[PDB]
Amino acid sequence: HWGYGKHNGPEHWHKDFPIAKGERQSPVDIDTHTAKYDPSLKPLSVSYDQATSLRILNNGHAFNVEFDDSQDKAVLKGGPLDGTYRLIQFHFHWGSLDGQGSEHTVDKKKYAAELHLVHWNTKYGDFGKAVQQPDGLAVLGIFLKVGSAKPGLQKVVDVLDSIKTKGKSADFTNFDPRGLLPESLDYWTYPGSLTTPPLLECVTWIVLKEPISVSSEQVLKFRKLNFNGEGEPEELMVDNWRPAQPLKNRQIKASFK
Numbered sequence: 001h002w003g004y005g006k007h008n009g010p011e012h013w014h015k016d017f018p019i020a021k022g023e024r025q026s027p028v029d030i031d032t033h034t035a036k037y038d039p040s041l042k043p044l045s046v047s048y049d050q051a052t053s054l055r056i057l058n059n060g061h062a063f064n065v066e067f068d069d070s071q072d073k074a075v076l077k078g079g080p081l082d083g084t085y086r087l088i089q090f091h092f093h094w095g096s097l098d099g100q101g102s103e104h105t106v107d108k109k110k111y112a113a114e115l116h117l118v119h120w121n122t123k124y125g126d127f128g129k130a131v132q133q134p135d136g137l138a139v140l141g142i143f144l145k146v147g148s149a150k151p152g153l154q155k156v157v158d159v160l161d162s163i164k165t166k167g168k169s170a171d172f173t174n175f176d177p178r179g180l181l182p183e184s185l186d187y188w189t190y191p192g193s194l195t196t197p198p199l200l201e202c203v204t205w206i207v208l209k210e211p212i213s214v215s216s217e218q219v220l221k222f223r224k225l226n227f228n229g230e231g232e233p234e235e236l237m238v239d240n241w242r243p244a245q246p247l248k249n250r251q252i253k254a255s256f257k
């Protein structure tokens, strides 16, 4: 099945998921000079104060920190969105080296990693229904560069040794996702897709302009994870990013000049 290797990587995904070659695939290169400022875009509203994290899981492709999404506890609103989008999980994509790892690029620049906070439109009732809708999801993407440590990330880093291999999960309560956010909520936005199979075209992407800095030690611990299950041959979980896809008939809008 699909993955990030030579024989099952992103260039192969279209054979099982034909939408891989669709009209609104993600990620994309964000050309900052051709994005258009849209003064009518509203400020993002990130309401994470009541977030209830549950657990952290290694799913063989990344690790997800999952949240209780059965009430409006951690929601994204405003910006380009109509309605209320609930946080269900966040995860990262990262590289084998600091010069790569992000999915979106900025003027072709790759960051060391990229955080995805995945939210779904409450009007569709559950995540499964939402991914079937063109406005079903809102993913907040945040770039990571290597520099100073991010204190709010360290609790994630420290639990990774308990979910080294595919299928392992651990309790991960009381984690505050606000500790992963940059100062500025200035953003780019465009319509796109999940960046892993099933690659469904259901996402309003909101990519923050300002990266967060993480330490080399922090991203090194991401790179010690494994794609494989326990007792299978060890393959480090690195370079779990899909490269930029054609923009096609889309315009990236910016909340800022």
Ligand SMILES: O=C(O)c1cccnc1
Pocket (backbone or CB within 6 Å): 116, 118, 194, 195, 196, 197, 198
């Ligand atoms: O690509 C993603 O972020 C994704 C794919 C499937 C399910 N949830 C998220």
Ligand SMILES: [Zn+2]
Pocket (backbone or CB within 6 Å): 091, 092, 093, 116, 195
């Ligand atoms: Zn992702």
